[PDB]
Amino acid sequence: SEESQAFQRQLTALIGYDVTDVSNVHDDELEFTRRGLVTPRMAEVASRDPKLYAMHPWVTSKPLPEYLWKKIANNCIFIVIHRSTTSQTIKVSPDDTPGAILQSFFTKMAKQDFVLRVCGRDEYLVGETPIKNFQWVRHCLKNGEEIHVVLDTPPDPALDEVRKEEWCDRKFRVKIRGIDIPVLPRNTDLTVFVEANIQHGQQVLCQRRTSPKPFTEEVLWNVWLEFSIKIKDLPKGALLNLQIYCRLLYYVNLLLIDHRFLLRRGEYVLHMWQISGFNADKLTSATNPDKENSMSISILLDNHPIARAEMPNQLRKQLEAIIATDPLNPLTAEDKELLWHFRYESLKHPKAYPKLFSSVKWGQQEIVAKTYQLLARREVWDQSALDVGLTMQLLDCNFSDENVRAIAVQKLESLEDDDVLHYLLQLVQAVKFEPYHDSALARFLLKRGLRNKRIGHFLFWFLRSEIAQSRHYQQRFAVILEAYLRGCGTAMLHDFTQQVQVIEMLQKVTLDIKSLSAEKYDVSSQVISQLKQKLENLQNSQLPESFRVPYDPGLKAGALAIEKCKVMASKKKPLWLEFKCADPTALSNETIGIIFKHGDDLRQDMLILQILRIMESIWETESLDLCLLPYGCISTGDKIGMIEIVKDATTIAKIQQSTVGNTGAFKDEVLNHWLKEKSPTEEKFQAAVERFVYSCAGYCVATFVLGIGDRHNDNIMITETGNLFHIDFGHERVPFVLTPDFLFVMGTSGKKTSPHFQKFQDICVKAYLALRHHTNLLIILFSMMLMTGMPQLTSKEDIEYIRDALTVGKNEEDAKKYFLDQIEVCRDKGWTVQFNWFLHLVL
Numbered sequence: 071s072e073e074s075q076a077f078q079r080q081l082t083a084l085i086g087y088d089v090t091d092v093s094n095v096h097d098d099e100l101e102f103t104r105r106g107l108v109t110p111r112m113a114e115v116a117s118r119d120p121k122l123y124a125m126h127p128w129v130t131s132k133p134l135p136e137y138l139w140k141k142i143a144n145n146c147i148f149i150v151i152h153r154s155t156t157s158q159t160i161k162v163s164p165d166d167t168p169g170a171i172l173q174s175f176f177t178k179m180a181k182q183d184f185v186l187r188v189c190g191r192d193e194y195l196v197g198e199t200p201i202k203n204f205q206w207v208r209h210c211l212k213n214g215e216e217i218h219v220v221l222d223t224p225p226d227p228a229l230d231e232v233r234k235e236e237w238c239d240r241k242f243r244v245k246i247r248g249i250d251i252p253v254l255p256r257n258t259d260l261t262v263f264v265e266a267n268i269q270h271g272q273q274v275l276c277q278r279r280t281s282p283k284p285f286t287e288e289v290l291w292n293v294w295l296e297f298s299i300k301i302k303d304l305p306k307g308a309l310l311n312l313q314i315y316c317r318l319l320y321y322v323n324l325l326l327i328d329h330r331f332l333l334r335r336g337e338y339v340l341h342m343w344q345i346s347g348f349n350a351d352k353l354t355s356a357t358n359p360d361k362e363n364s365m366s367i368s369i370l371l372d373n374h375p376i377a378r379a380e381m382p383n384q385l386r387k388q389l390e391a392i393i394a395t396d397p398l399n400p401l402t403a404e405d406k407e408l409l410w411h412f413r414y415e416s417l418k419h420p421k422a423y424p425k426l427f428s429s430v431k432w433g434q435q436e437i438v439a440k441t442y443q444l445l446a447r448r449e450v451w452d453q454s455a456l457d458v459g460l461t462m463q464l465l466d467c468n469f470s471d472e473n474v475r476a477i478a479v480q481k482l483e484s485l486e487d488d489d490v491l492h493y494l495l496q497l498v499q500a501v502k503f504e505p506y507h508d509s510a511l512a513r514f515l516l517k518r519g520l521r522n523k524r525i526g527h528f529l530f531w532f533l534r535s536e537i538a539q540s541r542h543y544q545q546r547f548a549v550i551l552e553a554y555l556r557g558c559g560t561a562m563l564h565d566f567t568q569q570v571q572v573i574e575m576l577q578k579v580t581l582d583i584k585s586l587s588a589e590k591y592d593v594s595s596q597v598i599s600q601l602k603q604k605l606e607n608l609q610n611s612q613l614p615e616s617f618r619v620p621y622d623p624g625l626k627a628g629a630l631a632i633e634k635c636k637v638m639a640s641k642k643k644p645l646w647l648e649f650k651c652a653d654p655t656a657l658s659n660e661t662i663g664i665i666f667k668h669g670d671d672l673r674q675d676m677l678i679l680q681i682l683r684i685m686e687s688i689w690e691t692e693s694l695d696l697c698l699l700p701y702g703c704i705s706t707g708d709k710i711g712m713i714e715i716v717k718d719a720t721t722i723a724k725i726q727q728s729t730v731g732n733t734g735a736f737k738d739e740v741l742n743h744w745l746k747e748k749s750p751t752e753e754k755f756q757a758a759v760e761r762f763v764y765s766c767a768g769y770c771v772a773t774f775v776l777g778i779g780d781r782h783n784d785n786i787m788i789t790e791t792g793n794l795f796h797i798d799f800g801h802e803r804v805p806f807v808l809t810p811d812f813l814f815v816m817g818t819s820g821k822k823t824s825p826h827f828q829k830f831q832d833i834c835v836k837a838y839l840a841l842r843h844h845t846n847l848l849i850i851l852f853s854m855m856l857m858t859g860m861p862q863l864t865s866k867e868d869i870e871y872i873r874d875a876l877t878v879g880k881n882e883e884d885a886k887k888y889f890l891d892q893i894e895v896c897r898d899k900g901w902t903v904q905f906n907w908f909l910h911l912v913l
């Protein structure tokens with residue numbers, strides 16, 4: 071039984087999709103995968119320290135930066151400790167441990183075991199880490215902030231308790247019987263044929279078509295298409311890709327070799343995906359669950375089992391020329407056969423791996439074997455330092471082989487929870503490229519999620535995000551998610567439960583409000599009024615008393631501050647919500663401010679924000695800080711999600727509107743005035759000016775490399791302390807935004823120089839040449855971003871932007887100049903591109 075199912079109904083409302091359902095399946099791959107993950111799960115559930123799991127200490131092993139050592143002028147750090155409005159300050163060494171620090175306290179007070187939680191967060195300072203390595207601590211230092219801690223007792227591991235569990239040499243050929251659609255598109259008489267590709271990691275190996283026929287709602291061919299590929303030549307994870315043209319309207323896929331290593335036999339009636347108008351949605355083994363409206367195709371398979379010399383000088387240089395080449399530079403036939411003939415020489419350079427493994431004729435049995443023999447002698451790979459860029463490329467859509475991919479996942483095992491979180495989003499998106507539902511990478515995510523509540527928490531939302539918004543992959547992900555929830559342990563099952571209730575109630579309210587204000591620039595009296603009452607109505611006897619904040623799980627949100635909630639003034643009508651801090655030990659009475667928005671796809675934003683963090687940590691490796699401000703954002707459902715409200719901030723546009731705010735007259739001098747009146751001292755002003763030169767610069771480089779640099783004033787923001795930040799990534803040109811008003815804060819005006827500009831240029835160019843040290847990583851991330859998170863993208867030119875941006879294949883000198891010019895374009899255009907948004911109101 072009875073409470074195996076109530077549970078299962080619980081798991082289904084948390085997941086947001088029913089995995090036990092089998093209405094959309096033509097084999098048993100998902101259920102097998104549900105069976106398959108019990109053990110990896112139970113393994114990690116069995117092997118985890120109950121205590122440390124309950125306290126999820128957030129820790130890093132990275133060096134403390136130069137800029138944060140400069141924040142410690144005494145080899146000594148302050149830490150206020152409280153019990154019940156009684157508290158003392160302790161002078162502590164950066165290398166002191168929480169345990170050790172508890173020795174130095176027990177003396178001071180009194181003349182059994184407790185723990186150091188952070189005042190106002192479900193965060194802890196525990197475990198054998200020197201405090202200098204707890205993330206909360208580094209964050210306090212960076213922002214000029216006092217470390218406040220309360221002395222309470224551990225959380226009880228019982229609360230995590232997991233519920234106990236209860237469970238031939240023939241050429242290949244394929245019979246096209248035909249297609250069926252209840253209702254035809256456009257309606258005139260065009261032309262229709264079927265295309266049947268045998269694919270492997272986007273390599274097309276062989277291809278046959280049918281004779282075309284007129285597009286009638288039922289078309290019949292009854293033809294064998296004989297490929298030349300031999301059955302024995304077919305490689306695991308090969309896809310029979312079936313497509314319809316009249317041109318490309320529909321596609322569906324079928325794994326020729328199933329999760330048991332059996333050739334696929336029998337009749338099939340696949341409901342096909344319809345195009346819109348390259349992209350990860352094109353790869354899915356899933357069929358369209360919409361049986362009533364979708365085009366469908368009918369087929370038959372009936373075809374069983376299966377599971378040196380010294381290299382000369384001037385070719386070495388061609389080989390090396392190739393290996394050095396970036397991830398997006400294409401390989402020639404010539405290239406590919408070079409790599410292959412010298413596969414053993416290539417095997418020594420881990421950088422060569424992606425290129426080498428795409429010089430493999432995967433449609434030849436013998437070659438694969440030699441390739442598997444090649445993988446056997448994996449000494450140099452196993453031993454190399456972990457390179458994420460390189461690891462990630464082997465997980466992209468170019469690699470379908472399970473053992474190539476698995477060595478990449480081998481290298482990720484050595485990542486610490488700190489780095490998993492950096493790449494988690496991108497690793498979840500890369501499940502989309504796995505031929506099978508059960509994969510080394512899917513198990514890795516599972517395993518790293520269960521090991522650590524912070525990874526588990528984000529794993530839940532990231533996966534739920536995709537389940538709710540993609541039919542192409544909701545089945546797969548729903549299976550991985552189910553597997554997570556069965557090991558995460560009852561505390562969390564209750565946490566997630568609270569969270570789902572909240573963000574479903576609030577989405578109702580978000581959408582009901584959009585209804586009332588048609589568009590009409592003004593947000594009405596009646597409008598805000600109805601907001602309040604709905605919120606009053608929800609708080610009254612339904613909403614959870616409290617809940618974790620999805621984009622920062624340390625924070626527990628209390629009641630809604632109904633007075634402060636409102637509707638924002640966009641064409642979309644996002645909610646502005648503020649909640650009380652549910653933690654009574656909180657250092658403040660400062661509300662938690664969340665924004666709910668429907669209208670842009672928030673997955674794009676998540677992805678962009680996450681590259682931003684990556685770019686921040688890349689800057690940590692050269693002791694740089696550009697004070698980026700990647701606010702929280704969790705994509706929750708269909709074109710909808712939540713956003714972190716940054717406190718004490720306004721729009722550039724609005725600082726322009728204050729003094730002028732005309733129809734578009736922009737003034738050079740206002741930004742600097744705004745800061746002064748929002749700086750009490752004149753010291754804190756120059757700090758704002760400082761913060762701004764870094765934040766401006768950071769956002770100039772980042773935004774440019776990503777090609778999201780021509781933005782409007784309104785979608786750029788500044789905090790009252792100089793911290794600048796772009797928002798709204800969902801949504802004559804300019805490379806980036808360095809307007810005359812930014813420039814005026816840098817003591818400069820329409821072609822001259824000055825100290826703070828000399829600084830700005832110094833940082834940009836450094837920031838720039840740095841990111842280029844990580845070219846391959848960024849290229850891989852961006853290219854993955856597009857394929858898994860955008861519309862349809864040109865599998866050359868949309869993607870090929872960034873490599874021209876990072877000015878690939880260039881000496882440092884050139885590239886610095888290249889950037890400097892870009893600044894000079896924004897100096898030439900001044901306000902002109904800014905100006906131009908409006909003017910087109912009628913264009």
Ligand SMILES: CC(=O)Nc1nc2ccc(-c3cccnc3)cc2s1
Pocket residue numbers: 665667701713714715716717718719720797798799
């Ligand atoms: C005080 C205040 O209004 N702060 C704000 N912070 C943010 C951060 C992000 C976004 C945002 C909104 C939509 C899409 N993307 C980001 C809006 C605000 S308002």
